[model samples]
Target: GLKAAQKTLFPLRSIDDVVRLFAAELGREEPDLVLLSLVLGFVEHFLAVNRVGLTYFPVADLSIIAALYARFTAQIRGAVDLSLYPREGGVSSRELVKKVSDVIWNSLSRSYFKDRAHIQSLFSFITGTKLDSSGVAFAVVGACQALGLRDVHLALSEDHAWVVFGPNGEQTAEVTWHGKGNEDRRGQTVNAGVAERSWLYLKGSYMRCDRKMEVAFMVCAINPSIDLHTDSLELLQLQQKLLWLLYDLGHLERYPMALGNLADLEELEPTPGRPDPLTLYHKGIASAKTYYRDEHIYPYMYLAGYHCRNRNVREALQAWADTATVIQDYNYCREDEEIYKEFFEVANDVIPNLLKEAASLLEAGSQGSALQDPECFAHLLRFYDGICKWEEGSPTPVLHVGWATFLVQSLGRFEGQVRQKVRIVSPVLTFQSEKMKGMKELLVATKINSSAIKLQLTAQSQVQMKK
Candidate 1:
């Protein structure tokens, strides 16, 4: 949900203010500045999303409606509030709707529909008026254009209706419509308003222009004056920034820190409608950087886990739950998977298993008694030696001389009768002794210039240990 009004820390009136504020905030030596910007970016996104939910569209749609309002005001030779419905009986509204209707009829030239009868049928269906196919096509095209969807190409359906609605749900309205010489195209509007719902219900459905609306909304956000006729560079930049911003906000999770003195930027203000591009760009960049950081690292939850190991489970779990909330709030689906999998596996499986095993062994008094058994010692040596073999490419020495010494200590603790049999017949002991000697020599003297030093240390240590 979005608040109707966000508190303002700074008012931005112009571009220079934005730059100065950005430099001031970013230039500071704060470590968590990125986090700030990211938080603010998310706040802005929340604002946008809430606005969309409430309005059933976004700022872009608002701007388009405003533009249409302006157009009608000019063409109808009076003040027209395009915000009101056509049936609203102001003289200005009536004149504007009639002019718009007439213009629509003219715009749907013969080229729009296949023949005269088809256009007449459509006119009768939508406007409830009898008109030729050409007139009907003109009206449909005009209305769509006035509504700012002129790029929508139309085609006659097999039944010759403009479009058809299918089993209805969110985004499931289907239709066939005139598309520039192509087979009658079909599509559904993911976002359906009352008017769109009615429009989609015709026997043949009109192709709902949701994708086009999205693109248009994006363009308007970046540039208020944006049009289908604008240069491709503007669109490319918008696309790049949108994707980058989305990535930063969802994955990085840098909030207010990323905004980088946005309060100051806002303080240096300008006109009501036109914001400075450089300011928006810098703000957007800072927001994006912060977003990237927060999302990439599971901050709250990771800290929670850290504390859990060092502190309390309840506190840690709370932190983890908060982290999950943050992930969900940002729509960070991809990041959530990795963090949840790794954290849950360690928490639920690894730690619990190790604790249970140690508890069982301690209860059975196997800890110290196992250390005194020659059979256990031999088995331990074999097991470790097999590990060394299996992990030969690993850098660490898995079975070192210290391990052999520990084995000797255990074997020496065995009863005299068990030792007598283990000592002489223990092929495992003999093999481990040879391996220990070889590893000791290699580790100590392989790169040493003096072999005498290595031999002296080894012999002395072995004799001392035996005593």
Candidate 2:
């Protein structure tokens, strides 16, 4: 009879079918009936009959069994009492709980691979909703709670979350929901490898386990400022970088000045047997660069801001320049024109302002003198010139208050006692005083000739005056 039940359960596909089989054979609709039978059979044969202390079973089989258990129990009214079964060999509750959790994780991860979505909500997965990296982690947590795995934890970061489980929280595992193309069979390997690989992966800081407050605050801080409606891969890459910045800021918890130099941003391997968070951060940066390649400016923009926040002025300046250069030739797609425009507007404001601030800090000699590379400054100026021309032709001119200030300061630093005139224009500037409330004037500047600079300030009533 047990062998017949096992045969019926082997090709399991539908929940309804499983329910029918349990009702027909076991004379009940309880979801745990099948699992109870399997466990009892295994124990009866392996431990009770053979009198062995422990034995190895296929994780895949256990995962399938666990999925069946979680799915059926989820539909039932209450939990099943596993204690009703005969416990001849002292089958401890802790041991049972461990087996249950391992099964749940393995089963859920297998489902995740089959679905090809990351982190799906357990409830959603049961109900057939879509999942992503973060959602998959949530589902695992939910399943653990449902199964009463008290010691398990859901380790979270800005963009990802994963599971950590052990008697004393000694083992960590992260399930990657999506695999590379032509790797459909990877899930089988993943389920087996996770038991060994995940502990090392967690120790290396490739993933983080963070508290609810930290994750919530970081998401709240970043969500409103980003554009989520676009399909641009570049924008997605930018979003990833932002997440890394948030992670680094939270983990280091140091003042920008004390955060050390930007050299640590280079990718480095984790030390053997120990994890390095900095190395993980660098890995994230490198991955973003490879994803965005030559078309995206946001990665450099993110890098510059990160460096600026950490008081690496010289490196920050260089990064800002790189951002500017990348944006100079960016072709805007109509589908995501607004996102591209917003990026450009933000670039115009932030890059120059950061350069201005970096110049001030360097001139103060607090972190050594300002970078004196004439070619670098010239290339940056060219980037500014390209943006200025682009803005001039825009339906609404982009405001750049730092443009005039940067020129003045740059001139003072680069050519002592030299003078230049910069040209400035725009109706946006014309409405600056009225539109930009709590502001007086918006300065616009253009270099009319190599030796001259022109500046203008727009006031109320459409009047522009030279400054």
Candidate 3:
């Protein structure tokens, strides 16, 4: 009954008031991108007094929304020549959009680390000449909106951010540099081999955000931490409330990452009477599968991670299976460094660590521990198979020698009785080179028993107590 509570909209003095302001702005036909972005930046940096150690509170006379509003208006109007803008069918030309990107790019400081914390905000743009990689993309969209072009929007993949515009939002352009020392792709349409066939490109499945969706993205992007050991409680609380608000408004229906982030927050501090963390994690998968054609892997990664943290070894194995399956469509690329780390961590860090911790109960052969299930073995095979499928025709490879060693070792843990319960339902998979000698075992199975495995995988997890 958020409706039962009285609400205030403007002069956001407290965190709840700011959330209400966001609720109202997002409830409209069109959200003011500039206003919301500025408010978040102001709140993000200012409220984390413990974060900055010395940053002062907002003086009562200070005006955040109006101040940011005028500054954005002045800067955009001062820099862009709206009268000279070229348009076709009411959409600004790609050239005009690139110039908009250039204005923001040129104004950035000549020598600053582009990946600094607390910089992905309009507050940074207004206060200084520095911005994070994501900040530049947001600035481009905000600038375009101020210039009366509603066609442009923030487009995202797992690893990078850019802008999309034109009729129905098809055209793409890079507004900032990604990763260290990348040959700058800035100010150009993001095509010519980059748009297709990479996890970085999301194989054309990237998020194309509308106004409210961008609001969801901004809320999701809010960094709540001060350091590894500490975080701003106010920021954390505000994000949770806003996420639930957006969820109620139906803004998160297609946003898989936001759903995953919300699920993560729920794990840290679950809201009473709300969907539990596991349900939210599954909701993340459900959203990704329905809307993203199952192209997103993080949803599954999040679920697999949850199972791992809880020491649900069998469920963790299958969740990782789900993760690899989603990567089946996209080809690997050098630019896909972010996702590479996710796969690497699972293949190396997470699974190895998990297996080490579970070796006791697993090898002990307790009845409830149930490492004897063949479907458990099938998940392992399907997991490795899907990864190889991802690298099927890619110029860039997926599995490394180190990764292969873990795969071979992981499989060897299962007893012959369990491993034999799984039937290799297809032809052999090949590594094709001796350099992958560790993965020579991959040649043993091409596919897993889907029909029988499905029956087993669907069975409930009791996590029955064992001595």
Candidate 4:
């Protein structure tokens, strides 16, 4: 026998508490029976559309529908009601599910859906129902509903329902209520007709997981019934395993397995957001990877190259340039930190080049005749271009570097004829460095004494030749 208190909190706690906790975790508060009804509605829809018809209902189980509802409501109501809903623009269950579903559909068809069978099979194991698109949509809707979003709609076809919500619904709604139509009344229309008519161009605007919690909530809500079946238990376990697997593959940096596990309940039915949970997970991961690998790493490497060029460290600059190439070409691994280590290793290798470039640019420019030399100026530009065009494999850095170099050289110092020819650099260099601490004074002193005469002459000559 188990201790009464332990038993109460563990295996058979009150359904209200379970619901409350679930909702709370979903960031909802005060969810009600209507939300429960919405979920049941989805389950009913799933059974009908999937051609399950009356197979699930037993001859002796007279109160199956009512019991299921009661059990579901009791188990999750408290959590649903207590879950947090973003107050800025609160969404209904239907609306939230719809938007989430649309995102999933968009992603799946593009990349996620090509592997849809694998996803469906996995869902069937945990959910006990062979999930097509409709089933998946329902699951996601339920999960989103659990999070206290009430504005939801499910579009049912022969085998799937695409969930939709939010302002624009060309793919999900007939007329978007909040986005394109009116200032005060914009609602998205995402019926089947609308979905068919939508051009595929606007798919990138779809919102996905803000973090791990959102993914877990959606996954849990979609597959709520997994906890009630014996065979489904193995599927449930597999669902968890697969969830993490897909999560890593998708490149979602963090994993909150505890919350993900909570969504694996056995008796829970599919909501409107169903099968696309995994699909959505992959989409979010892919987006993160693209942003990190494409936008961020390349720019940082370029900056490191600039430092190398300025300091005249040929070896160091070459090394950093090499690193930039490797990162650009490196086959990025989703979710594994190994890629970051490699990226940083390359980044670190380029640091020496950066420092050397900074020193060399300063030293060479200080030597008047050396600074005036066209070869010196050309070499400097090569270094500048190397860092700025981290991926382009070119001699010139970014345009900004070229333009800045031109202006600074043309203008020379404050006193000379060079200063009269040019106006200003586009991105004015902020004097944040100690080397730049007395730039104004140094410029005046150098100009008056012609200390940097050779450098100024060479720099100006290069500018004229380039122009």
The lDDT for every candidate, in the order shown, is: 0.32, 0.37, 0.75, 0.33
Which candidate ranks first by lDDT, i.e. highest?
3
Candidate 3 structure, TM-score to reference: 0.86
Best first by lDDT, ranked: 3, 2, 4, 1
Q: What digit string (tens of lDDT, one per residue) describes model 4 on residues 364-432?
A: 665533233333322332333233333233222122332343424322412343222222222122222
For model 1, give the RMSD to the true fold.
25.3
Candidate 3 lDDT at 65 equals 59
lDDT at 387, model 2 = 47
Can you write out model 3's per-residue Cα lDDT over 168-267, one digit (the tens) per residue? 7888888888888758887676675355678877767778889888899889878887777888877888899999999999999988889889988988
In model 4, what lDDT does residue 379 have? 30
- How does residue 193 of candidate 3 score in lDDT? 37
Query: Each prediction's TM-score against the native?
Result: 0.18, 0.32, 0.86, 0.21
Worst 10 residues of 4 by lDDT: 197-206
lDDT, candidate 1, 344-411, per-residue tens: 35334533443344345546775444323445434433333333332233222233343344333322
Q: Give the candidate number with the greatest TM-score.
A: 3
lDDT string for model 2 (339-423, tens) is: 3454454445554565567677667774343445444444344444434433433344443444444544454443321112221
- Residue 256's lDDT within candidate 3 is 86
Q: Please say which candidate is ahead in TM-score: 1 or 3.
A: 3
